[PDB]
Design a protein around this ligand. Structure first.
Ligand SMILES: O=C(CCCS)NC1CCN(Cc2ccccc2)CC1
Length: 356
């Protein structure tokens, strides 16, 4: 339908994440919370860290309940650590409901909070299997669905340079143009998808598609870049470099070691046997103003981060185990080329593209 009061409920800074306003405890304690489809923990600052505008003060909340258990969460760059419990959570600019969700009260963290950022926590919207310490700690959205009449679905419109919309429990049709195209969620842990073909400026990379999903391919609102696996990255860069011989750039720039074009198509597995669709991004999407090359190599797989997500309206249709892509109404298009979602295409042996 409409969900007009949820539109434009996300803020941020370039490369610094997208956040929704949330309240915790009774009376409500307001916190800005990073929106992360690449993790499954709801975690907030609960101690006066210098970088924080505010923090969760448990002693002030009557509805707080201690779970008397600790949680240690190391990311690649840095870690956070906290004390588990539950409390009443709301999303002011979301649905009118209040849920008892697990909260990780961050007592200690290293390289997690950003000096100068305006957020105080993280909302992991992915599934239980990747929730820390283990799959028994129910992720926020799972509690929201179990406790209220909010449908098991949420959508994201991230708008490049910073704002956007998280539509909880539905789809706002104003936020996209044309048809939605759905790819199946491979397994419910990350939001894992299968990439079946990659074109740089409408030319196939001719690679084994099993390479494009090396380990995994996921939709990650918490990652800034498009993260391509090493083997795919090298072939992609060489091809992007080939199109861009009009200009000159240092060797380290493509490696993400310096600062300062072809469209990039990702063919994704469709709902139907031998059927695919493709999503297409403009240079506006992978050239991030600080300009930086917002495509980087990875060992964990393809991460369809903010670079990808900023061109498209993205439906996390958890109910139907699928993810929807449509042209975002807010993506950065010029007069020449426009970001696209196109289909159907004929693609055989798509099932073989998923690494095991
Ligand atoms: O581990 C993964 C998926 C690996 C394939 S790329 N995603 C994490 C999930 C946690 N998220 C937290 C975070 C987000 C923004 C700023 C700081 C930290 C960082 C990205």
């Amino acid at each position: 339908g409409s969900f007009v009061e949820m539109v434009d409920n996300l803020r941020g800074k370039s490369g610094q994440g997208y956040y929704v306003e949330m309240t915790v405890g009774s009376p409500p304690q307001t916190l800005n919370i990073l929106v992360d489809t690449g993790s499954s923990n709801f975690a907030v600052g609960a101690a006066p860290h210098p970088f924080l505008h505010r923090y969760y003060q448990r002693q002030l909340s009557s509805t707080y309940r201690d779970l008397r258990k600790g949680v240690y969460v190391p990311y690649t760059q840095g870690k956070w650590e906290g004390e588990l419990g539950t409390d009443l959570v709301s999303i002011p600019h979301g649905p009118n409901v209040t849920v008892r969700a697990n909260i990780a009260a961050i007592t200690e963290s290293d390289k997690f909070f950003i000096n100068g950022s305006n957020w105080e926590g993280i909302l992991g919207l992915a599934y239980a299997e990747i929730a820390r310490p283990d799959d028994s700690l129910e992720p926020f959205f799972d509690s929201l669905v179990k406790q209220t009449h909010v449908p098991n679905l949420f959508s994201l419109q991230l708008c490049g340079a910073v704002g956007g919309s998280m539509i909880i429990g539905g789809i706002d049709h104003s936020l996209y143009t044309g048809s939605l195209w759905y790819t199946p969620i491979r397994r419910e842990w990350y939001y894992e998808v299968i990439i079946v073909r990659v074109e740089i400026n409408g030319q196939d990379l001719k690679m084994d598609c099993k390479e494009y999903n090396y380990d995994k391919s996921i939709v990650d609102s918490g990652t800034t870049n498009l993260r391509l696996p090493k083997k795919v990255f090298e072939a992609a860069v060489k091809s992007i470099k080939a199109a861009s011989s009009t200009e000159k750039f240092p060797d380290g720039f493509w490696l993400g070691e310096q600062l300062v074009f072809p469209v990039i198509s990702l063919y994704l597995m469709g709902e139907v046997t031998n059927q695919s669709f493709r999503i297409t991004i403009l240079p506006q999407q992978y050239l991030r103003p600080v300009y930086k090359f917002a495509i980087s190599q990875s060992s964990t797989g393809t991460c369809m981060g903010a670079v990808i997500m900023e061109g498209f309206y993205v439906v996390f249709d958890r109910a139907r185990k699928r993810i929807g892509f449509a042209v975002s109404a807010c993506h950065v298009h010029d007069e020449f080329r426009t970001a696209a979602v196109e289909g159907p295409f004929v693609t055989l042996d798509m099932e073989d593209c998923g690494y095991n």
